[PDB]
Amino acid sequence: ERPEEVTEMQRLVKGEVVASTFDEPASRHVQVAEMVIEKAKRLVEHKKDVIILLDSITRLARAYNTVVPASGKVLTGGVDANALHRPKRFFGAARNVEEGGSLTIIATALIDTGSKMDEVIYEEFKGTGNMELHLSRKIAEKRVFPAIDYNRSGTRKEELLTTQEELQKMWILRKIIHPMGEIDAMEFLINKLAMTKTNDDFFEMMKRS
């Protein structure tokens, strides 16, 4: 990540933040990732809730690809077969331990970058995570933010993460949003939440209407 972004992260987070710039080699990236994942595992071993925000898994996968020794089995775009094994483990460490504590990983991915490497990395990581969120450039072209594709996003097995009534409240919201266009849906949602004060207030406002 660029140094100015690194220092902005430094100054805009309460928790500790670690970054390796593009100036430093890929071995630096992989060792930083190993340090972070090992520290997270050690902390969660003590029944601690650890959260890791990763930006980005694509660059980490590229660094692992360009640091791992070759194996003779290269995919399209120049991605080695066993190169992606290490990042997946890093992204597979996220779990909810029954003994105590949890390890949550929110890792962002890059798409439509004009690269075959990034596309291959996305395809190999597409069906892995259990929570997922798309953003789109064309929604941000209207400068309405956040540029979130509501219809195409979602979470799996959300039932265990919420109570009953608000679940079908959100289902009704999804049924309302789905026919609308994604830009239209986003602007509608922004306008509706603008005049409310709380998600519960928005829920009651939409169900009374």
Binding site: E98, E159, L160, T163, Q164
Partner: protein, 187 residues
Amino acid sequence: TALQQAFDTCQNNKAAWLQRKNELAAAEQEYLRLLSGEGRNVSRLDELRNIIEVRKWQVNQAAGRYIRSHEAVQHISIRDRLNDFMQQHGTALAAALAPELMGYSELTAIARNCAIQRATDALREALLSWLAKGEKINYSAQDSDILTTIGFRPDVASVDDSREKFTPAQNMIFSRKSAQLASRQSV
């Protein structure tokens, strides 16, 4: 002799429903107390809401089971009192209702159930005419105590808390959540 076991089952189902009500009330008041507080324990509030939902489902299930047990006790007591009344006045009832009764002994099933429904209708007007005086109806000899402890009808709370119904999807999800909560309590 199954009526005593049915009465015991009704009693323990009532106790289970009452205790369910107690921890539901305790969780509810604790959640309101935490809401009154100024702490930022949002995750605590979310898990408290989950607890409220799970306990409400458990209370509904316990109330339904208690209602079923109450109905079973009433049915078995009615059947037993019916049997030891009919073993006394069967000849008299047969003499007063004879035609369709020896029609049953040799007629086909169509005539059998036609006579059955004619007899039940006739006794229906018989009862609705007899209830005109409406004297204080007393319980039986040995089942009076059981019927008094069980009561004429279940509690109003145990019936109004069961107005809401859950489809098997909700039943499955709440069973899974209750099992998870039981595992949490065990640990």
